[PDB]
């Protein structure tokens, strides 16, 4: 389901990243990067590693 | 006269429908009744592939709202949304920003269309 959500988010906003909405795109970009780069010593329940591919995709 | 224009518009006689609406405009006693005709008249020019000509009529329909201390009517809402969209293609973001703000009191889809356009022009402002 999370892979589907990741591809869903990517396809809806296709071509919205060529910005030099920008604030909100920057907020979404930094949130997704936070998801992909966060390192957890203890496994959080609602952010498992399954969403990493979706965030990356 | 307005009804005759609709029949010509619906039968693929765009060349005649243009002249029909212009006659209707003169017969109208009050300017405010010409708000509906102006928007449709501008559309017919858009079907007659000449976008520059329809701009002058888009000025008048929008300007009636200002002359009527902010009538804020439905057929001017579509006028501002279309006018702002074309102004983005013209590269004049500042002249397009105020158009979106002035139409921020329309329908649910009208306000969001101008709100996103307002953000787009503000960034390039």
Curated annotation (Swiss-Prot), chain A:
Belongs to the APC1 family. The APC/C is composed of at least 13 subunits that stay tightly associated throughout the cell cycle: APC1, APC2, APC4, APC5, APC9, APC11, CDC16, CDC23, CDC26, CDC27, DOC1, MND2 and SWM1. APC1 interacts directly with MND2. Component of the anaphase promoting complex/cyclosome (APC/C), a cell cycle-regulated E3 ubiquitin-protein ligase complex that controls progression through mitosis and the G1 phase of the cell cycle. The APC/C is thought to confer substrate specificity and, in the presence of ubiquitin-conjugating E2 enzymes, it catalyzes the formation of protein-ubiquitin conjugates that are subsequently degraded by the 26S proteasome. It comes from the Eukaryota. It is found in: Nucleus; Cytoplasm; Cytoplasm, Cytoskeleton, Spindle pole. This is Anaphase-promoting complex subunit 1. Present with 178 molecules/cell in log phase SD medium. The chain holds residues 1167 to 1249 of 1748 of the full protein. The gene is APC1.
UniProtKB/Swiss-Prot annotation, chain B:
Changing residue 72 to I: In CDC23-40; G2/M cell cycle arrest at 37 degrees Celsius. TPR repeats lie at residues 1-31, 35-68. It is found in: Nucleus; Chromosome, Centromere, Kinetochore. Phosphorylated by CDC28, which is required for the early mitotic activity of the APC/C in its CDC20-bound form. Present with 80 molecules/cell in log phase SD medium. The APC/C is composed of at least 13 subunits that stay tightly associated throughout the cell cycle: APC1, APC2, APC4, APC5, APC9, APC11, CDC16, CDC23, CDC26, CDC27, DOC1, MND2 and SWM1. CDC23 interacts directly with SWM1 and binds the destruction box (D-box) of the substrate cyclin CLB2. Component of the anaphase promoting complex/cyclosome (APC/C), a cell cycle-regulated E3 ubiquitin-protein ligase complex that controls progression through mitosis and the G1 phase of the cell cycle. The APC/C is thought to confer substrate specificity and, in the presence of ubiquitin-conjugating E2 enzymes, it catalyzes the formation of protein-ubiquitin conjugates that are subsequently degraded by the 26S proteasome. Belongs to the APC8/CDC23 family. This is Anaphase-promoting complex subunit CDC23. The lineage of its organism: Eukaryota, Fungi, Dikarya, Ascomycota, Saccharomycotina. The gene is CDC23.
């Amino acid at each position: 389901y999370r892979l589907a959500a990741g591809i869903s988010l990517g396809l809806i906003n296709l071509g919205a990243g060529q910005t030099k909405q920008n604030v909100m795109y920057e907020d979404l970009t930094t949130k997704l990067l936070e998801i992909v780069t966060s390192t957890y010593d203890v496994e959080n329940d609602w952010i498992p590693e399954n969403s990493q591919i979706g965030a990356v995709i | 006269w307005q009804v005759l224009g609709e029949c010509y518009s619906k039968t693929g006689n765009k060349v005649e429908a243009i002249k029909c609406y212009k006659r209707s405009i003169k017969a109208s006693q009050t300017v405010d009744q010409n708000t509906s005709i102006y928007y449709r008249l501008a559309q017919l020019y858009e079907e007659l592939e000449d976008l520059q000509e329809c701009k002058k009529f888009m000025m008048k329909c929008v300007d009636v709202e200002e002359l009527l201390e902010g009538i804020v009517t439905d057929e001017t809402v579509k006028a501002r949304l279309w006018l702002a969209i074309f102004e983005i293609k013209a590269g004049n973001y500042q002249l397009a920003y105020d158009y979106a703000m002035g139409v921020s009191s329309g329908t649910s889809q009208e306000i969001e269309e101008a709100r996103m356009l307002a953000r787009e022009c503000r960034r390039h402002m």
